[PDB]
Subunit: 152 residues, 2 copies
């Protein structure tokens, strides 16, 4: 039932836009990229925060979309956009943070679209479980760095 | 002019919700406080980021709301709610101070906006938007990070 909640659907929509954005950022102007990222990340965080509690079934493993190749290509492309503004000391890189967030978000929405209720539920549960200490954490840390790039 | 902007209206709405939430802090538990602030802050940041370009008209200075007493009382109440959770290293900072600082800019803006004088409604908006980039915006993201850790970070640390 959870996978049918309005909050879940709204999260999927924002997640899909977030992934499509990064996947097509190639050669985008830095200022535009930073400005847009600072608008999508807060919304993604908000939508995830409003998700209902999802319980893991654990009987069927969801497919895993992101490969090392996909991760590296994306990381490299984002790094080239940010250039000398990519690094920050907390030595971390915004490009790496975004690629790590993408990994969790992309793996989730890919499976959600496959239409199998059991894996749709577990892909959501996995995404929610990883929010706290993995992608959600990187998101808030990343926003600080990006905000600094734009205004500091 | 811009004070009728669709983005301005939505910003006013979340800004008021934010100020009201902090003002009612003594009426809730820490769990509720933390969970809600992590929802209000990202929305406040997003709406501020979507505001249209504003220009200073000048003339008359907008009325101010936040006094030292208002600021101190709020800071202390927030500090009491968070307790040992208030402090975070990121230099030692306090979530309560960050929130009170953001509140100063947001509260001054919405108070004036409701007074109904077009000129100062515009100028208070311009000032708030300018200070978003100059200082409040960074305090907001820093606080979000701190609060995120308060809610999700593994406890039982040394």
């Amino acid at each position: 039932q959870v996978i049918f909640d309005k909050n879940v659907i709204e999260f999927v929509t924002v997640a899909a836009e977030f992934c499509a954005f990064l996947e097509r950022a190639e050669s985008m102007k830095r200022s535009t990229f930073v400005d847009t990222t600072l608008k999508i990340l807060p919304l993604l965080y908000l939508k995830a925060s409003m998700l209902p509690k999802c319980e893991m079934i654990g009987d069927e493993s969801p497919e895993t979309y992101v490969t090392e190749e996909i991760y590296e290509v994306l990381r490299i492309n984002l790094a080239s956009i940010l250039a000398e503004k990519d690094d920050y000391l907390e030595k971390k890189n915004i490009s790496e943070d975004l690629a790590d967030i993408y990994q969790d978000i992309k793996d989730f929405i890919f499976v959600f679209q496959l239409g199998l209720n059991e894996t749709m539920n577990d892909s959501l549960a996995i995404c929610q479980e990883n929010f706290g200490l993995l992608w959600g954490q990187k998101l808030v840390n990343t926003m600080r760095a990006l905000h600094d790039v734009k205004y500091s």
